[PDB]
Amino acid sequence: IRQKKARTILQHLSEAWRCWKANIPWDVPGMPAPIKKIIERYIKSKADAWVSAAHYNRERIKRGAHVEKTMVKKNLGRLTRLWIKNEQERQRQIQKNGPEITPEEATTIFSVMVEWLESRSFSPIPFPPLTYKNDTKILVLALEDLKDVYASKVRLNASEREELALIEEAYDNPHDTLNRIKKYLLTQRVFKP
Amino acid sequence: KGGVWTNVEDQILKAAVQKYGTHQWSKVASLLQKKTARQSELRWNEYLNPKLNFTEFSKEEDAQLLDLARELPNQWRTIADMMARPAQVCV
Amino acid sequence: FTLLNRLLRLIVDPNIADYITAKNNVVINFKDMSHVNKYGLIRGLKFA
Amino acid sequence: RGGISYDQLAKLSYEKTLRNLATQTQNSSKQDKVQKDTKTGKITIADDDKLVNKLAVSLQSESKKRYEARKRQMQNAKTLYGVESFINDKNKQFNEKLSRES
Amino acid sequence: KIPAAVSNWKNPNGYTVALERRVENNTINDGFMKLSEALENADKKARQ
Amino acid sequence: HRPQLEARSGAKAAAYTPTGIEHARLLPGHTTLKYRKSWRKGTAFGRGYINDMTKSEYHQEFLHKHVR
Amino acid sequence: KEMLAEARARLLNTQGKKATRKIRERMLEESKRIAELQKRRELKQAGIN
Amino acid sequence: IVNRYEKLLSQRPEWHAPWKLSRVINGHLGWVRCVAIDPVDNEWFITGSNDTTMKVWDLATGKLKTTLAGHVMTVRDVAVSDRHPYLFSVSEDKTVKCWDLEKNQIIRDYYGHLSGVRTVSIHPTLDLIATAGRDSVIKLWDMRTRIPVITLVGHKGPINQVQCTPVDPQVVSSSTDATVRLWDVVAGKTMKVLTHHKRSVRATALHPKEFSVASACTDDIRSWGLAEGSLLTNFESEKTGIINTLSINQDDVLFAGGDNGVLSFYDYKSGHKYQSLATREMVGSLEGERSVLCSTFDKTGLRLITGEADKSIKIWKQDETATKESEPGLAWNPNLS
RNA sequence: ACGAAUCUCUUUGCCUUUUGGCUUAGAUCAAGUGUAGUAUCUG
RNA sequence: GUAUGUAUUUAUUUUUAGAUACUAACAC
């Protein structure tokens, strides 16, 4: 067989590349092993060339000599991909390996901090009981500081439109928004991406 | 204003993911009005996806759970991976 | 984070400490790429 | 179990046509050279007009039969599987290939 | 036999295909369990 | 209506008639060959080639720097 | 029911802007052929060829 | 036909010595596609790469002399000249670049391929070049004036490997249509065709003496007499596929590089395989990356140089102990074909 | 009784209209707005 | 303040109100 399996196998190539950019492992549920050897080979090759082009263009921009308008954008893209790959690598290796610090060093550290915080006779910061004197003020500050990002904008995006909208309601009912806020502080331990 | 999920919209989303794949969400919110990408993708990963585990909890599931929740102070993304479950189900 | 929770326990009530500690474990998304953040600090949080 | 190499298959088809031919001969029994020019090397072979027409009719007939049977598999093929959602015929057919891949 | 190739990214002809054509084992490390334990102990020692 | 499935045989170009345009890079150049012949104590503490691009050391140096 | 009907409409069509255009343009061309043919048949019915 | 099989049991061929691994040289960033050796002094290599460079390694110590950049894409082939101080490199960028070894700078560019050019061979006595690639034609370049003097239409697919010979057929070529053509250039048409290969003929080599060629394919490495164009011999090969390269020592040893990483050495006379090795991949490599892209022998023929897909060059030396104590290889059993 | 042929149906084999490229996922993301030409829904 | 594309054969070859609408180099 040729052409059917031609187009199919080359599609598998492209898909394996995309999955290599995305750091997704790319197993095909079934597929003859030797072909998988080959495609893994070529995609490793293309990967190395791609990375090396990213380094080279970056160190060409650091000197700042005739880089095209787009090459800056594209190079940025390749660098962010690479950086996230380094991150995920570090995290996985921490799972397999286990935490770096060691129990000894950790115990010493915690002891140090405790010794200090007694040396300074420090009181652990309480939780902000309602009827806190400054609650409404600290609200006003925080809400203003979020508001300012929007304020110096000629035109506003919908997500931005939402961000500015949520605060405005916020002004109307501080007491409720405090209830919700502190309720989140207690209940919610799982957050959005 | 932020909406909850009718079975209509939910179904349309499932058929959409079936056609367009996971990664094109902004095309999923094209079909589905009143909703955003982040909302779509968010729900598909959190709830709708069939690969997710919604099931009863064995006597071992609970033991392993309590074990982890004691071992790892609050981190419910990590633990969720350890249990292969959506997080807020685990919490 | 195992350490952070404890060193924040010293300074702050365990509620806020646990909160902050959990807030740093979140799925991070760029386009396709996504990964849980299992280890380091996220410097973009307002209280980072 | 299993596949068949393009040789064995070729042999089998040859045998099949031999049987068919032998049956034409028996039923025909029931109902009842080489010259090369000196000028050019062109060879000429005496032929019976019968059996040549019988040959053409055999080929045409078998082509008709094959075309028809495949056509019926066309018909049933699309009418059998209505389970999953499909936009067009070609989709349904592709997904039946995915059923073959299992 | 080469399987069919079905991608998350592109579906150019508009073929709609089953979710399962679209769509971990290892346990947590030993070292982390020890590290968490020491702190639970250290605080207890600290408390006294 | 996309990709190559083949390449163009030079054989075709071999049968065409020449145009005779004069290019810049075929102007004569290199026209001749060459032939060969107490304070210290009080403190709390203190008293290789992988083949791959991403997991090398230079790379983690690189991204460790340019990403700040 | 409206957005569901519309979803049902978009999910069933993969034609594309160029492809839809070439289908309909081919329809136009075939129509033109049919027209010229039946012209010639009518003029033939009057004897002019 | 048994008579032939008896006549295979009389000969008991040609003892040789085994090979082993002398030296490993890392230092390319990408794969190593091609290798050629200074035909006079044996002082160095020029090695292509998949990173576009070419790195001139010293043969003696393995140190790196210099780097020649200048191609924008991978370099499929490199060939150094005898009579001239020139180095012709050629790549996937559609271009055949000359190199003046004296000043180490590109002298000439030859132009006119439609697409990537995978082979250069330097005609021994004529001051010509022969280039070929996915064009599916062989271009005979006049070295001085950069004029593609002759074009050889022929193979129905890409052309992998090309060689040059002083007498008739002056160009031998091998293509993915699974043929090997023996060309007559003056008339500009095929003198002889050799069709016996079943799939793409991906490698050839000229015997430095006997005036014959060794052709390869997936599983079957044959030989061919030039002149008449007869078959000469076959070589015993079970599946070794894929054979990327061949090289012929002056002692009548025929090397065969595998894509499975196996190094299959043969006697050239017989067809017998006296040794098979397996390379070690590398520290962090993949089991897929173990293969042999190119190879050659020095002018002596007592060393072997193989570029591998693991980004390393390896230098294989012939054992001096050997003899009959325990050399003996697979020991000549001619199975039925 | 089995050998032989035609028609019909089921199972296996063969795949038949059964996803044809690269780049920074190639980039981006909604009430959007007034009026106007023309289609048509009801008493 | 649309590339671009198609066609442009004349001179005679032997036998009752409006709602939902689509769109508009037309008005921020």
PDB file of C-alpha atoms in Angstrom, chain H residues 10-254:
ATOM      1  CA  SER H  10      34.137 -25.321  -2.870  1.00  0.00           C
ATOM      2  CA  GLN H  11      35.383 -21.767  -2.264  1.00  0.00           C
ATOM      3  CA  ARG H  12      35.530 -21.137   1.470  1.00  0.00           C
ATOM      4  CA  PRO H  13      36.180 -17.447   1.118  1.00  0.00           C
ATOM      5  CA  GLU H  14      38.623 -14.868   2.067  1.00  0.00           C
ATOM      6  CA  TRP H  15      39.406 -14.514   5.719  1.00  0.00           C
ATOM      7  CA  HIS H  16      39.504 -11.001   7.213  1.00  0.00           C
ATOM      8  CA  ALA H  17      39.748  -9.451  10.651  1.00  0.00           C
ATOM      9  CA  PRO H  18      36.977  -7.953  12.729  1.00  0.00           C
ATOM     10  CA  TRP H  19      36.452  -4.263  13.491  1.00  0.00           C
ATOM     11  CA  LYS H  20      35.995  -2.357  16.719  1.00  0.00           C
ATOM     12  CA  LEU H  21      35.387   1.122  18.013  1.00  0.00           C
ATOM     13  CA  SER H  22      38.419   3.378  18.331  1.00  0.00           C
ATOM     14  CA  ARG H  23      37.010   6.845  18.808  1.00  0.00           C
ATOM     15  CA  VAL H  24      33.869   8.856  19.372  1.00  0.00           C
ATOM     16  CA  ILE H  25      33.685  12.479  18.382  1.00  0.00           C
ATOM     17  CA  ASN H  26      30.722  14.576  19.384  1.00  0.00           C
ATOM     18  CA  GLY H  27      30.505  18.204  18.254  1.00  0.00           C
ATOM     19  CA  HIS H  28      27.858  18.578  15.594  1.00  0.00           C
ATOM     20  CA  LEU H  29      24.622  20.247  16.634  1.00  0.00           C
ATOM     21  CA  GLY H  30      22.446  18.359  14.152  1.00  0.00           C
ATOM     22  CA  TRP H  31      22.776  15.018  12.354  1.00  0.00           C
ATOM     23  CA  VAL H  32      25.781  14.187  10.343  1.00  0.00           C
ATOM     24  CA  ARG H  33      24.698  13.588   6.798  1.00  0.00           C
ATOM     25  CA  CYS H  34      27.915  13.166   4.789  1.00  0.00           C
ATOM     26  CA  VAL H  35      31.611  12.569   5.174  1.00  0.00           C
ATOM     27  CA  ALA H  36      34.544  12.816   2.841  1.00  0.00           C
ATOM     28  CA  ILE H  37      38.212  12.528   3.327  1.00  0.00           C
ATOM     29  CA  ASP H  38      41.246  14.423   2.082  1.00  0.00           C
ATOM     30  CA  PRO H  39      42.256  12.229  -0.828  1.00  0.00           C
ATOM     31  CA  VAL H  40      45.948  13.054  -0.644  1.00  0.00           C
ATOM     32  CA  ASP H  41      47.344  13.422   2.862  1.00  0.00           C
ATOM     33  CA  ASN H  42      44.710  11.714   5.013  1.00  0.00           C
ATOM     34  CA  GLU H  43      45.007  14.526   7.427  1.00  0.00           C
ATOM     35  CA  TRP H  44      41.342  15.353   7.796  1.00  0.00           C
ATOM     36  CA  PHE H  45      37.625  14.974   7.263  1.00  0.00           C
ATOM     37  CA  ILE H  46      35.006  17.247   5.946  1.00  0.00           C
ATOM     38  CA  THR H  47      31.747  16.341   7.479  1.00  0.00           C
ATOM     39  CA  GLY H  48      28.407  17.756   6.379  1.00  0.00           C
ATOM     40  CA  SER H  49      25.679  18.241   8.883  1.00  0.00           C
ATOM     41  CA  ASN H  50      22.076  18.855   9.368  1.00  0.00           C
ATOM     42  CA  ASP H  51      22.876  22.198  11.015  1.00  0.00           C
ATOM     43  CA  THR H  52      24.115  23.579   7.666  1.00  0.00           C
ATOM     44  CA  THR H  53      27.751  23.743   8.711  1.00  0.00           C
ATOM     45  CA  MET H  54      30.714  21.674   7.703  1.00  0.00           C
ATOM     46  CA  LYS H  55      33.369  20.914  10.302  1.00  0.00           C
ATOM     47  CA  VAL H  56      36.843  19.880   9.283  1.00  0.00           C
ATOM     48  CA  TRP H  57      38.099  17.331  11.745  1.00  0.00           C
ATOM     49  CA  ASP H  58      41.673  16.138  12.063  1.00  0.00           C
ATOM     50  CA  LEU H  59      41.940  12.418  11.379  1.00  0.00           C
ATOM     51  CA  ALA H  60      44.947  11.816  13.611  1.00  0.00           C
ATOM     52  CA  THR H  61      43.767  13.255  16.932  1.00  0.00           C
ATOM     53  CA  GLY H  62      40.091  13.921  16.102  1.00  0.00           C
ATOM     54  CA  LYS H  63      40.380  17.622  16.994  1.00  0.00           C
ATOM     55  CA  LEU H  64      38.348  20.166  15.154  1.00  0.00           C
ATOM     56  CA  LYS H  65      40.295  22.317  12.748  1.00  0.00           C
ATOM     57  CA  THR H  66      37.800  24.747  11.240  1.00  0.00           C
ATOM     58  CA  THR H  67      34.164  25.348  10.426  1.00  0.00           C
ATOM     59  CA  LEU H  68      32.795  26.201   7.008  1.00  0.00           C
ATOM     60  CA  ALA H  69      29.330  27.775   7.093  1.00  0.00           C
ATOM     61  CA  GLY H  70      27.614  29.165   3.971  1.00  0.00           C
ATOM     62  CA  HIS H  71      24.603  26.940   3.367  1.00  0.00           C
ATOM     63  CA  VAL H  72      21.214  27.907   4.701  1.00  0.00           C
ATOM     64  CA  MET H  73      19.877  24.330   4.938  1.00  0.00           C
ATOM     65  CA  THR H  74      21.195  20.831   5.483  1.00  0.00           C
ATOM     66  CA  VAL H  75      24.141  19.587   3.563  1.00  0.00           C
ATOM     67  CA  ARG H  76      23.481  16.297   1.938  1.00  0.00           C
ATOM     68  CA  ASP H  77      26.766  15.751   0.253  1.00  0.00           C
ATOM     69  CA  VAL H  78      30.388  16.770   0.199  1.00  0.00           C
ATOM     70  CA  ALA H  79      33.204  15.803  -2.117  1.00  0.00           C
ATOM     71  CA  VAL H  80      36.836  16.784  -2.162  1.00  0.00           C
ATOM     72  CA  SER H  81      38.964  16.900  -5.246  1.00  0.00           C
ATOM     73  CA  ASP H  82      42.207  15.117  -6.107  1.00  0.00           C
ATOM     74  CA  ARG H  83      43.782  17.209  -8.814  1.00  0.00           C
ATOM     75  CA  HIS H  84      42.394  20.451  -7.471  1.00  0.00           C
ATOM     76  CA  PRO H  85      42.514  22.149  -4.124  1.00  0.00           C
ATOM     77  CA  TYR H  86      38.722  22.407  -4.261  1.00  0.00           C
ATOM     78  CA  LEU H  87      35.885  21.167  -2.140  1.00  0.00           C
ATOM     79  CA  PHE H  88      32.402  20.850  -3.667  1.00  0.00           C
ATOM     80  CA  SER H  89      29.576  20.867  -1.177  1.00  0.00           C
ATOM     81  CA  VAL H  90      25.934  20.525  -1.974  1.00  0.00           C
ATOM     82  CA  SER H  91      22.744  20.880  -0.062  1.00  0.00           C
ATOM     83  CA  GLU H  92      18.951  20.963   0.047  1.00  0.00           C
ATOM     84  CA  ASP H  93      18.936  24.668  -0.812  1.00  0.00           C
ATOM     85  CA  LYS H  94      19.136  23.869  -4.524  1.00  0.00           C
ATOM     86  CA  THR H  95      22.816  24.839  -4.834  1.00  0.00           C
ATOM     87  CA  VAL H  96      26.188  23.395  -5.488  1.00  0.00           C
ATOM     88  CA  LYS H  97      28.917  25.478  -3.915  1.00  0.00           C
ATOM     89  CA  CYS H  98      32.613  25.245  -4.664  1.00  0.00           C
ATOM     90  CA  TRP H  99      35.139  25.927  -1.931  1.00  0.00           C
ATOM     91  CA  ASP H 100      38.741  26.999  -2.360  1.00  0.00           C
ATOM     92  CA  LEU H 101      40.684  25.086   0.178  1.00  0.00           C
ATOM     93  CA  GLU H 102      43.528  27.615   0.089  1.00  0.00           C
ATOM     94  CA  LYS H 103      41.557  30.658   1.337  1.00  0.00           C
ATOM     95  CA  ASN H 104      38.483  28.813   2.751  1.00  0.00           C
ATOM     96  CA  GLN H 105      35.868  30.863   0.952  1.00  0.00           C
ATOM     97  CA  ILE H 106      33.192  30.090  -1.535  1.00  0.00           C
ATOM     98  CA  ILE H 107      34.453  30.579  -5.040  1.00  0.00           C
ATOM     99  CA  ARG H 108      31.681  29.494  -7.363  1.00  0.00           C
ATOM    100  CA  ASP H 109      28.026  28.704  -7.327  1.00  0.00           C
ATOM    101  CA  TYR H 110      26.467  26.410  -9.873  1.00  0.00           C
ATOM    102  CA  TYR H 111      22.852  27.151 -10.621  1.00  0.00           C
ATOM    103  CA  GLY H 112      19.994  25.394 -12.194  1.00  0.00           C
ATOM    104  CA  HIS H 113      18.588  22.606 -10.100  1.00  0.00           C
ATOM    105  CA  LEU H 114      14.837  22.712  -9.581  1.00  0.00           C
ATOM    106  CA  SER H 115      15.131  21.313  -6.087  1.00  0.00           C
ATOM    107  CA  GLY H 116      17.364  19.823  -3.413  1.00  0.00           C
ATOM    108  CA  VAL H 117      20.580  18.298  -4.664  1.00  0.00           C
ATOM    109  CA  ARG H 118      21.642  15.161  -2.882  1.00  0.00           C
ATOM    110  CA  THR H 119      24.758  14.051  -4.650  1.00  0.00           C
ATOM    111  CA  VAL H 120      28.042  15.337  -5.959  1.00  0.00           C
ATOM    112  CA  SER H 121      30.769  13.337  -7.571  1.00  0.00           C
ATOM    113  CA  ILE H 122      33.884  14.746  -9.154  1.00  0.00           C
ATOM    114  CA  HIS H 123      34.878  13.163 -12.420  1.00  0.00           C
ATOM    115  CA  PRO H 124      38.462  11.948 -12.134  1.00  0.00           C
ATOM    116  CA  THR H 125      40.127  13.244 -15.297  1.00  0.00           C
ATOM    117  CA  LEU H 126      37.805  15.777 -16.945  1.00  0.00           C
ATOM    118  CA  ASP H 127      37.402  18.767 -14.585  1.00  0.00           C
ATOM    119  CA  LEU H 128      33.673  18.147 -14.362  1.00  0.00           C
ATOM    120  CA  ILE H 129      31.184  17.844 -11.580  1.00  0.00           C
ATOM    121  CA  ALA H 130      28.200  15.548 -11.516  1.00  0.00           C
ATOM    122  CA  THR H 131      25.312  16.646  -9.346  1.00  0.00           C
ATOM    123  CA  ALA H 132      21.894  15.155  -8.814  1.00  0.00           C
ATOM    124  CA  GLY H 133      18.847  15.309  -6.654  1.00  0.00           C
ATOM    125  CA  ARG H 134      15.077  15.411  -6.581  1.00  0.00           C
ATOM    126  CA  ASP H 135      15.163  16.989 -10.046  1.00  0.00           C
ATOM    127  CA  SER H 136      15.348  13.409 -11.323  1.00  0.00           C
ATOM    128  CA  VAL H 137      18.153  14.410 -13.653  1.00  0.00           C
ATOM    129  CA  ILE H 138      21.919  14.345 -13.503  1.00  0.00           C
ATOM    130  CA  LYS H 139      23.685  17.574 -14.288  1.00  0.00           C
ATOM    131  CA  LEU H 140      27.182  17.537 -15.638  1.00  0.00           C
ATOM    132  CA  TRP H 141      28.718  20.861 -14.722  1.00  0.00           C
ATOM    133  CA  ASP H 142      31.774  22.367 -16.346  1.00  0.00           C
ATOM    134  CA  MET H 143      33.942  23.187 -13.358  1.00  0.00           C
ATOM    135  CA  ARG H 144      35.483  26.314 -14.841  1.00  0.00           C
ATOM    136  CA  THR H 145      32.664  28.189 -16.507  1.00  0.00           C
ATOM    137  CA  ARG H 146      29.795  27.028 -14.321  1.00  0.00           C
ATOM    138  CA  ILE H 147      27.830  25.904 -17.359  1.00  0.00           C
ATOM    139  CA  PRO H 148      25.577  22.889 -16.924  1.00  0.00           C
ATOM    140  CA  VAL H 149      27.036  21.347 -20.034  1.00  0.00           C
ATOM    141  CA  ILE H 150      25.156  18.055 -20.190  1.00  0.00           C
ATOM    142  CA  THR H 151      21.891  16.904 -18.676  1.00  0.00           C
ATOM    143  CA  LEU H 152      21.007  13.231 -18.390  1.00  0.00           C
ATOM    144  CA  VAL H 153      17.310  12.527 -18.560  1.00  0.00           C
ATOM    145  CA  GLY H 154      16.455   9.054 -17.388  1.00  0.00           C
ATOM    146  CA  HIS H 155      15.253   7.946 -13.983  1.00  0.00           C
ATOM    147  CA  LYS H 156      11.603   8.259 -13.172  1.00  0.00           C
ATOM    148  CA  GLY H 157      12.219   9.464  -9.645  1.00  0.00           C
ATOM    149  CA  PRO H 158      14.676  11.203  -7.359  1.00  0.00           C
ATOM    150  CA  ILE H 159      18.334  10.348  -7.717  1.00  0.00           C
ATOM    151  CA  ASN H 160      20.077   9.253  -4.571  1.00  0.00           C
ATOM    152  CA  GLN H 161      23.614   8.478  -5.411  1.00  0.00           C
ATOM    153  CA  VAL H 162      25.945   9.253  -8.296  1.00  0.00           C
ATOM    154  CA  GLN H 163      29.508   8.171  -9.173  1.00  0.00           C
ATOM    155  CA  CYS H 164      32.060   8.873 -11.875  1.00  0.00           C
ATOM    156  CA  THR H 165      34.455   6.614 -13.751  1.00  0.00           C
ATOM    157  CA  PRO H 166      37.250   7.327 -16.229  1.00  0.00           C
ATOM    158  CA  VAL H 167      36.293   4.947 -19.052  1.00  0.00           C
ATOM    159  CA  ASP H 168      32.812   3.974 -20.161  1.00  0.00           C
ATOM    160  CA  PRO H 169      30.060   4.352 -18.235  1.00  0.00           C
ATOM    161  CA  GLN H 170      31.405   7.577 -16.910  1.00  0.00           C
ATOM    162  CA  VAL H 171      28.389   8.114 -14.692  1.00  0.00           C
ATOM    163  CA  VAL H 172      26.590   5.542 -12.612  1.00  0.00           C
ATOM    164  CA  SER H 173      23.347   6.579 -10.974  1.00  0.00           C
ATOM    165  CA  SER H 174      20.815   5.153  -8.628  1.00  0.00           C
ATOM    166  CA  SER H 175      17.298   6.289  -8.000  1.00  0.00           C
ATOM    167  CA  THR H 176      14.155   5.674  -6.042  1.00  0.00           C
ATOM    168  CA  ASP H 177      12.591   4.007  -9.023  1.00  0.00           C
ATOM    169  CA  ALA H 178      14.744   1.063  -7.971  1.00  0.00           C
ATOM    170  CA  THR H 179      17.109   1.077 -10.896  1.00  0.00           C
ATOM    171  CA  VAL H 180      20.741   1.774 -11.539  1.00  0.00           C
ATOM    172  CA  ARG H 181      21.718   3.308 -14.815  1.00  0.00           C
ATOM    173  CA  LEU H 182      25.048   3.211 -16.508  1.00  0.00           C
ATOM    174  CA  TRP H 183      25.386   6.305 -18.606  1.00  0.00           C
ATOM    175  CA  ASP H 184      27.206   7.197 -21.795  1.00  0.00           C
ATOM    176  CA  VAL H 185      27.637  10.942 -21.558  1.00  0.00           C
ATOM    177  CA  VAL H 186      28.950  11.930 -24.969  1.00  0.00           C
ATOM    178  CA  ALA H 187      25.847  10.591 -26.673  1.00  0.00           C
ATOM    179  CA  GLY H 188      23.930  11.516 -23.517  1.00  0.00           C
ATOM    180  CA  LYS H 189      21.806   8.425 -23.054  1.00  0.00           C
ATOM    181  CA  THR H 190      21.649   5.261 -21.073  1.00  0.00           C
ATOM    182  CA  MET H 191      24.255   2.696 -21.996  1.00  0.00           C
ATOM    183  CA  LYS H 192      22.778   0.021 -19.708  1.00  0.00           C
ATOM    184  CA  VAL H 193      20.032  -0.331 -17.119  1.00  0.00           C
ATOM    185  CA  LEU H 194      20.181  -2.574 -14.090  1.00  0.00           C
ATOM    186  CA  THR H 195      16.757  -3.297 -12.718  1.00  0.00           C
ATOM    187  CA  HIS H 196      17.411  -6.098 -10.302  1.00  0.00           C
ATOM    188  CA  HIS H 197      16.657  -4.081  -7.186  1.00  0.00           C
ATOM    189  CA  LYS H 198      13.233  -4.280  -5.742  1.00  0.00           C
ATOM    190  CA  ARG H 199      13.052  -0.885  -4.043  1.00  0.00           C
ATOM    191  CA  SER H 200      14.891   2.421  -3.855  1.00  0.00           C
ATOM    192  CA  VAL H 201      18.604   2.073  -4.375  1.00  0.00           C
ATOM    193  CA  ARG H 202      19.804   4.272  -1.699  1.00  0.00           C
ATOM    194  CA  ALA H 203      23.536   3.722  -1.775  1.00  0.00           C
ATOM    195  CA  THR H 204      26.408   2.814  -4.054  1.00  0.00           C
ATOM    196  CA  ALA H 205      30.184   2.566  -3.861  1.00  0.00           C
ATOM    197  CA  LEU H 206      32.963   2.026  -6.380  1.00  0.00           C
ATOM    198  CA  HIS H 207      35.543  -0.640  -5.699  1.00  0.00           C
ATOM    199  CA  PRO H 208      38.887   1.174  -5.712  1.00  0.00           C
ATOM    200  CA  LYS H 209      40.436  -1.526  -7.998  1.00  0.00           C
ATOM    201  CA  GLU H 210      38.225  -4.171  -9.658  1.00  0.00           C
ATOM    202  CA  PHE H 211      36.174  -1.615 -11.690  1.00  0.00           C
ATOM    203  CA  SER H 212      32.804  -2.591 -10.351  1.00  0.00           C
ATOM    204  CA  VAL H 213      30.165  -1.027  -8.156  1.00  0.00           C
ATOM    205  CA  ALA H 214      28.232  -2.161  -5.126  1.00  0.00           C
ATOM    206  CA  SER H 215      24.606  -1.240  -5.051  1.00  0.00           C
ATOM    207  CA  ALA H 216      22.223  -1.392  -2.150  1.00  0.00           C
ATOM    208  CA  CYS H 217      18.514  -1.521  -1.416  1.00  0.00           C
ATOM    209  CA  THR H 218      16.440  -2.371   1.649  1.00  0.00           C
ATOM    210  CA  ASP H 219      17.393  -5.979   2.243  1.00  0.00           C
ATOM    211  CA  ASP H 220      19.684  -6.832  -0.634  1.00  0.00           C
ATOM    212  CA  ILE H 221      23.135  -5.548  -1.352  1.00  0.00           C
ATOM    213  CA  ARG H 222      24.217  -6.580  -4.813  1.00  0.00           C
ATOM    214  CA  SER H 223      27.343  -5.936  -6.799  1.00  0.00           C
ATOM    215  CA  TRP H 224      27.719  -5.108 -10.459  1.00  0.00           C
ATOM    216  CA  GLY H 225      30.473  -5.360 -12.968  1.00  0.00           C
ATOM    217  CA  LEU H 226      30.848  -2.208 -15.017  1.00  0.00           C
ATOM    218  CA  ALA H 227      31.889  -2.504 -18.671  1.00  0.00           C
ATOM    219  CA  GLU H 228      29.541  -5.326 -19.733  1.00  0.00           C
ATOM    220  CA  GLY H 229      27.149  -4.410 -16.925  1.00  0.00           C
ATOM    221  CA  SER H 230      26.840  -7.941 -15.573  1.00  0.00           C
ATOM    222  CA  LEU H 231      25.638  -8.839 -12.130  1.00  0.00           C
ATOM    223  CA  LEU H 232      28.865 -10.173 -10.589  1.00  0.00           C
ATOM    224  CA  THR H 233      27.769 -11.286  -7.156  1.00  0.00           C
ATOM    225  CA  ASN H 234      25.117 -11.000  -4.468  1.00  0.00           C
ATOM    226  CA  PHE H 235      25.628 -10.498  -0.783  1.00  0.00           C
ATOM    227  CA  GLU H 236      23.978 -12.544   1.921  1.00  0.00           C
ATOM    228  CA  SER H 237      21.590 -10.252   3.735  1.00  0.00           C
ATOM    229  CA  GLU H 238      18.575 -11.147   5.806  1.00  0.00           C
ATOM    230  CA  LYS H 239      16.608  -8.065   6.686  1.00  0.00           C
ATOM    231  CA  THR H 240      19.189  -5.428   7.480  1.00  0.00           C
ATOM    232  CA  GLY H 241      16.936  -2.716   6.077  1.00  0.00           C
ATOM    233  CA  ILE H 242      17.481  -0.029   5.537  1.00  0.00           C
ATOM    234  CA  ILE H 243      20.973   0.260   4.068  1.00  0.00           C
ATOM    235  CA  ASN H 244      21.998   3.891   4.123  1.00  0.00           C
ATOM    236  CA  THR H 245      25.542   3.591   2.990  1.00  0.00           C
ATOM    237  CA  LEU H 246      28.268   1.459   1.505  1.00  0.00           C
ATOM    238  CA  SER H 247      32.022   1.784   1.473  1.00  0.00           C
ATOM    239  CA  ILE H 248      34.716  -0.381   0.028  1.00  0.00           C
ATOM    240  CA  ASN H 249      38.124  -0.837   1.632  1.00  0.00           C
ATOM    241  CA  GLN H 250      41.210  -1.496  -0.516  1.00  0.00           C
ATOM    242  CA  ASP H 251      41.325  -4.981   1.041  1.00  0.00           C
ATOM    243  CA  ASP H 252      38.008  -5.906  -0.552  1.00  0.00           C
ATOM    244  CA  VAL H 253      35.944  -5.318   2.566  1.00  0.00           C
ATOM    245  CA  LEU H 254      32.440  -3.995   1.917  1.00  0.00           C
TER     246      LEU H 254
END
